[PDB]
Amino acid sequence: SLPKWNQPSKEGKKITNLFVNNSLTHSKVEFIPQEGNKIKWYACGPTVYDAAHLGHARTYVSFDIIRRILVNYFKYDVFMVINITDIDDKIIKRSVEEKIGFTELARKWEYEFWEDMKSLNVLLPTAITRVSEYVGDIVKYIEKIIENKYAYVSEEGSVYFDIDEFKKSEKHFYARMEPLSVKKKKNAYDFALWKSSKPNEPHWDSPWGKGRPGWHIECSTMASNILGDVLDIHSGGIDLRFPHHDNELAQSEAFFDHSQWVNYFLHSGHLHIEGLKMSKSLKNFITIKNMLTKYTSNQIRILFLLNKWDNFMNYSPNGESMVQCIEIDKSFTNFFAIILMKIKNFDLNSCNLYWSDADNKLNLLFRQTKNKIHEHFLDNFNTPDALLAIQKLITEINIYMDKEKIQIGLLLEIKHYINFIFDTFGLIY
Amino acid sequence: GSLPKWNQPSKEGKKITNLFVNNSLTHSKVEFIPQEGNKIKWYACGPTVYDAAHLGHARTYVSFDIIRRILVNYFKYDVFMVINITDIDDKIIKRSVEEKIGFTELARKWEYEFWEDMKSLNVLLPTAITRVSEYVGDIVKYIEKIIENKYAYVSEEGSVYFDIDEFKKSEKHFYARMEPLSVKKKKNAYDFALWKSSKPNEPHWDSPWGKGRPGWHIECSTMASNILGDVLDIHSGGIDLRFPHHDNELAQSEAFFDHSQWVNYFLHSGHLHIEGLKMSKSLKNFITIKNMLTKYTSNQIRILFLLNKWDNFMNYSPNGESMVQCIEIDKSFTNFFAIILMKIKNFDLNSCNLYWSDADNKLNLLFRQTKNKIHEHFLDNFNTPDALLAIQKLITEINIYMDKEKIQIGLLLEIKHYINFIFDTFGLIY
Numbered sequence: 001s002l003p004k005w006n007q008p009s010k011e012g013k014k015i016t017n018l019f020v021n022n023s024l025t026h027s028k029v030e031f032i033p034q035e036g037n038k039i040k041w042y043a044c045g046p047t048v049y050d051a052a053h054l055g056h057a058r059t060y061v062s063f064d065i066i067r068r069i070l071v072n073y074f075k076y077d078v079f080m081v082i083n084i085t086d087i088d089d090k091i092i093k094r095s096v097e098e099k100i101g102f103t104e105l106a107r108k109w110e111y112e113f114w115e116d117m118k119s120l121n122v123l124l125p126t127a128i129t130r131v132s133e134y135v136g137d138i139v140k141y142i143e144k145i146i147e148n149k150y151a152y153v154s155e156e157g158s159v160y161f162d163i164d165e166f167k168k169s170e171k172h173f174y175a176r177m178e179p180l181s182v183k184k185k186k187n188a189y190d191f192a193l194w195k196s197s198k199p200n201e202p203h204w205d206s207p208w209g210k211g212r213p214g215w216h217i218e219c220s221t222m223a224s225n226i227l228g229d230v231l232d233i234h235s236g237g238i239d240l241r242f243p244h245h246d247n248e249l250a251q252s253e254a255f256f257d258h259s260q261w262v263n264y265f266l267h268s269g270h271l272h273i274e275g276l277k278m279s280k281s282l283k284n285f286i287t288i289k290n291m292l293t294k295y296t297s298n299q300i301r302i303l304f305l306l307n308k309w310d311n312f313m314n315y316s317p318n319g320e321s322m323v324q325c326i327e328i329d330k331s332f333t334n335f336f337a338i339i340l341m342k343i344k345n346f347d348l349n350s351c352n353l354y355w356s357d358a359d360n361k362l363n364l365l366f367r368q369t370k371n372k373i374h375e376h377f378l379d380n381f382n383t384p385d386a387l388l389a390i391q392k393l394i395t396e397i398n399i400y401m402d403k404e405k406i407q408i409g410l411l412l413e414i415k416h417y418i419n420f421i422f423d424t425f426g427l428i429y
Numbered sequence: 430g431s432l433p434k435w436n437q438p439s440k441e442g443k444k445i446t447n448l449f450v451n452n453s454l455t456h457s458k459v460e461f462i463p464q465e466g467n468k469i470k471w472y473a474c475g476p477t478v479y480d481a482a483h484l485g486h487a488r489t490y491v492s493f494d495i496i497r498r499i500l501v502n503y504f505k506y507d508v509f510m511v512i513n514i515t516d517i518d519d520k521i522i523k524r525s526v527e528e529k530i531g532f533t534e535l536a537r538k539w540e541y542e543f544w545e546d547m548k549s550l551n552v553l554l555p556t557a558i559t560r561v562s563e564y565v566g567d568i569v570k571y572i573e574k575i576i577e578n579k580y581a582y583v584s585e586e587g588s589v590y591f592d593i594d595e596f597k598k599s600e601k602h603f604y605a606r607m608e609p610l611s612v613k614k615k616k617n618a619y620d621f622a623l624w625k626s627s628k629p630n631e632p633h634w635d636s637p638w639g640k641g642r643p644g645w646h647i648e649c650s651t652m653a654s655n656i657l658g659d660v661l662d663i664h665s666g667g668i669d670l671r672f673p674h675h676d677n678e679l680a681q682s683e684a685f686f687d688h689s690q691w692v693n694y695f696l697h698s699g700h701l702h703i704e705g706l707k708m709s710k711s712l713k714n715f716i717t718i719k720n721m722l723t724k725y726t727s728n729q730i731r732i733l734f735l736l737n738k739w740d741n742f743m744n745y746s747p748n749g750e751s752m753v754q755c756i757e758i759d760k761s762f763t764n765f766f767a768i769i770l771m772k773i774k775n776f777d778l779n780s781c782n783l784y785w786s787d788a789d790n791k792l793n794l795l796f797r798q799t800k801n802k803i804h805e806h807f808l809d810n811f812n813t814p815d816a817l818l819a820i821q822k823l824i825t826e827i828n829i830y831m832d833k834e835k836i837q838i839g840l841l842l843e844i845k846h847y848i849n850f851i852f853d854t855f856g857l858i859y
């Protein structure tokens with residue numbers, strides 16, 4: 001009566017002792033690749049009908065940080081896919097208001113989305129999967145689910161997922177992550193894999209008649225096509241956990257007829273503003289472009305670094321939440337300025353390089369800081385505490401650079417390490 | 430009994446990568462295991478600063494720079510690295526009476542040029558730099574402790590010699606761990622000086638035994654022990670230093686701490702030969718680093734060294750012969766970056782199709798396989814020749830993909846970032 005989860009076997013895998021908050025277990029569990037040091041990761045992308053806002057930025061920056069930690073810090077081999085939802089009721093409706101076709105609208109806002117991602121130093125994924133380019137694959141995916149007896153066709157030409165049949169199977173559980181969130185149909189909870197189109201909507205041909213993919217089947221199809229029958233990581237905002245992500249699991253399990261399509265399901269917390277999710281529906285949003293006319297990429301990334309990725313956060317506007325981010329960015333800038341000049345201007349001809357007690361104390365604190373930050377990253381990508389550890393080290397390096405005769409090589413190694421961590425954070429100085 | 434023992438560090442609580450390194454203490458490739466956590470305490474013997482550095486010096490310090498970058502940037506070990514400057518030596522004293530600019534000033538001049546040459550070759554400064562002239566007092570105290578442990582004696586002239594026979598007698602000590610077969614004021618001829626009584630008009634320093642100078646080997650034992658302590662993860666130098674210099678350091682340091690293993694992994698770079706012989710100031714066959722840099726770039730010189738396994742000897746053919754291949758490779762890397770950056774720059778997300786095709790999948794498979802190949806090469810005693818070849822092969826395929834196939838912008842960027850990461854690890858700059 002309660003879903004089971006299979007931790008992957010550790011034999012032959014890269015083992016870091018990283019723990020992650022897995023929505024499949026509702027707990028922090030050890031992260032173990034399916035294969036070697038490889039990580040196959042699908043992340044749900046945007047619905048491209050309008051500009052991206054600060055809440056979208058929080059989710060993609062947070063997962064960009066996690067990806068950089070996984071790749072640059074831990075040296076996992078990450079194969080990442082992000083989709084573009086360029087077929088959607090929202091796109092269709094917006095396109096009839098603006099009197100532009102659905103494709104030209106979608107391409108415009110996909111373009112702006114990637115521009116906004118680049119402006120925030122978010123890395124592009126390995127693969128970008130647009131629904132409009134995968135419709136034929138979605139149809140074949142739906143055919144096999146029907147052939148496995150987990151979907152049925154209405155008289156209208158729609159196709160619905162058969163929840164009751166899926167639950168009946170001993171090897172399958174419906175709504176693994178939110179069990180308690182559960183006319184032409186068998187049961188009301190059945191959701192559409194193929195929607196029969198009205199003759200005026202955009203549509204595609206299929207064995208069941210002209211229609212469009214249902215929302216959830218788009219992501220099962222695209223992720224399965226590129227990454228296969230086992231994903232190491234699937235991610236998205238917490239709102240997507242049910243029904244979207246639980247429905248993807250059911251569809252993909254039905255397609256492959258196995259019991260675990262995703263090993264680790266990661267959900268970022270929402271960015272709130274004045275207590276409510278930043279949302280286009282609520283008219284309380286700040287576009288990324290507007291945000292970047294007031295704050296820098298570094299400052300916005302520091303905002304997200306200060307908040308644990310899987311917890312919700314509140315944004316206080318009119319600069320309130322950004323005061324601290326600006327101060328921290330200012331301290332990193334001034335730290336780098338001094339250390340870079342001291343390295344550049346150091347004169348090996350005239351210096352004394354005896355290793356003093358002050359050099360030894362700074363070095364001990366340096367190595368201890370590396371160990372603290374390692375433990376923070378292993379603790380479910382705890383960037384708030386890793387950022388604080390860096391701040392504390394900088395406070396001491398600043399004292400040292402002002403007062404002590406300086407060990408040029410120690411300062412250079414410290415600079416390289418802090419740069420390495422800032423690269424992992426996505427900060428550019 | 431008659432053969433030295435080596436103790437592999439325990440694996441419990443350590444970073445374990447399955448890296449194997451060629452350990453001169455075992456004369457074999459053995460798994461590298463940190464003494465503590467993921468830390469590596471590493472001392473590398475530095476230059477004797479009386480003249481310009483030459484290409485053979487460059488090979489040793491670039492090779493250890495590559496190894497350090499692999500350990501830190503690739504494997505994420507925490508490396509605490511010390512390199513010394515031998516600025517007190519008989520060569521420096523003799524050179525300074527010829528040059529007449531003063532002994533300290535001459536040594537400092539050629540130390541400065543050594544660091545300039547290292548800077549020109551993109552070699553990273555170590556964590557700590559230990560000059561003998563700044564450590565003489567600590568050296569005197571180190572010698573005092575060895576005498577107090579009965580492993581050194583004082584001659585009537587005021588020199589101090591290490592007592593080999595007393596040292597070997599101890600069951601816990603073995604003399605010449607790495608080259609066992611290489612073995613008037615003295616007890617035995619094989620005794621070596623820890624303190625040399627100064628002759629008139631030479632530079633000298635005070636000591637309890639009279640004015641003198643350190644012996645060569647005690648400088649490195651003292652400086653390494655002072656900063657890094659009683660167990661070094663790695664000690665390194667050119668192969669010529671293995672005996673007598675490095676074996677004597679082990680004996681001195683074991684005598685100081687009265688234990689049996691001061692160094693866990695002793696690594697020796699192979700010599701650069703030219704026309705069949707070690708490039709050597711004595712043979713008049715050397716090329717200075719500066720001369721080399723008026724003809725070739727940092728990248729090309731580092732590629733020369735990446736193409737040769739660090740612990741094997743290599744042959745340098747001059748007049749550009751050995752550099753032809755290095756120039757070709759460097760040009761192909763420059764051209765690769767030029768092309769891929771233009772393809773990325775010219776890519777239009779509006780007008781493209783991004784379906785993940787068979788060609789995209791085949792390139793991705795090749796990419797991931799290249800990562801695993803390069804990983805096994807680095808684990809195989811830092812095999813940069815095979816890792817460089819893997820990158821070359823991958824680039825050949827990326828070039829084909831960019832010319833004809835519709836390109837996955839994200840895949841091209843990710844591959845460029847990986848190649849940048851490996852090139853950062855090699856010390857190449859594009």
Ligand SMILES: Nc1ncnc2c1ncn2[C@@H]1O[C@H](COP(=O)(O)OP(=O)(O)OP(=O)(O)O)[C@@H](O)[C@H]1O
Pocket residue numbers: 011012013014015036037075077446447800801804
């Ligand atoms: N940077 C990397 N690139 C590629 N693969 C990596 C990397 N780091 C680690 N790995 C993979 O991590 C795994 C390490 O696991 P571990 O060394 O504990 O296994 P093992 O039991 O010794 O077996 P084996 O090494 O033979 O798979 C290896 O499969 C190796 O392929």
Ligand SMILES: Nc1ncnc2c1ncn2[C@@H]1O[C@H](COP(=O)(O)OP(=O)(O)OP(=O)(O)O)[C@@H](O)[C@H]1O
Pocket residue numbers: 015016017370371374441442443444445466467505506507
């Ligand atoms: N990148 C790193 N930075 C800092 N410390 C590291 C790093 N990688 C490994 N370590 C250190 O390696 C030691 C062991 O880590 P490892 O992942 O090998 O776990 P383990 O073998 O299960 O050991 P244990 O749980 O007993 O520490 C720890 O002390 C950890 O601090």
Ligand SMILES: Nc1ncnc2c1ncn2[C@@H]1O[C@H](COP(=O)(O)OC(=O)[C@@H](N)CS)[C@@H](O)[C@H]1O
Pocket residue numbers: 044045046047048054055056058059083085219236237238239240268269270271272277278279
């Ligand atoms: N206030 C907020 N705070 C933090 N994250 C937020 C957020 N508001 C939205 N997000 C996150 O932004 C991503 C794109 O949301 P879309 O609605 O554009 O698209 C879709 O949901 C489909 N195209 C997926 S296939 C999702 O992971 C969402 O949970």
Ligand SMILES: Nc1ncnc2c1ncn2[C@@H]1O[C@H](COP(=O)(O)OC(=O)[C@@H](N)CS)[C@@H](O)[C@H]1O
Pocket residue numbers: 474475476477478484485486488489513514515649666667668669670698699700701702707708709
């Ligand atoms: N042809 C050649 N090829 C490759 N490496 C070479 C080389 N010729 C020399 N080397 C290496 O260069 C380094 C500095 O040599 P020095 O003589 O300057 O100093 C000393 O020996 C002491 N100051 C050490 S405390 C050593 O590691 C040496 O083995």
Ligand code: NA
Pocket residue numbers: 166167168169170171172173
């Ligand atoms: Na069931």
Ligand code: NA
Pocket residue numbers: 238239240241242243
């Ligand atoms: Na929800």
Ligand code: NA
Pocket residue numbers: 596597598599600601602603604
């Ligand atoms: Na003995």
Ligand code: NA
Pocket residue numbers: 668669670671672673
């Ligand atoms: Na020798």
Ligand SMILES: [Zn+2]
Pocket residue numbers: 044045219244
């Ligand atoms: Zn999705």
Ligand SMILES: [Zn+2]
Pocket residue numbers: 474475649674
């Ligand atoms: Zn030495």
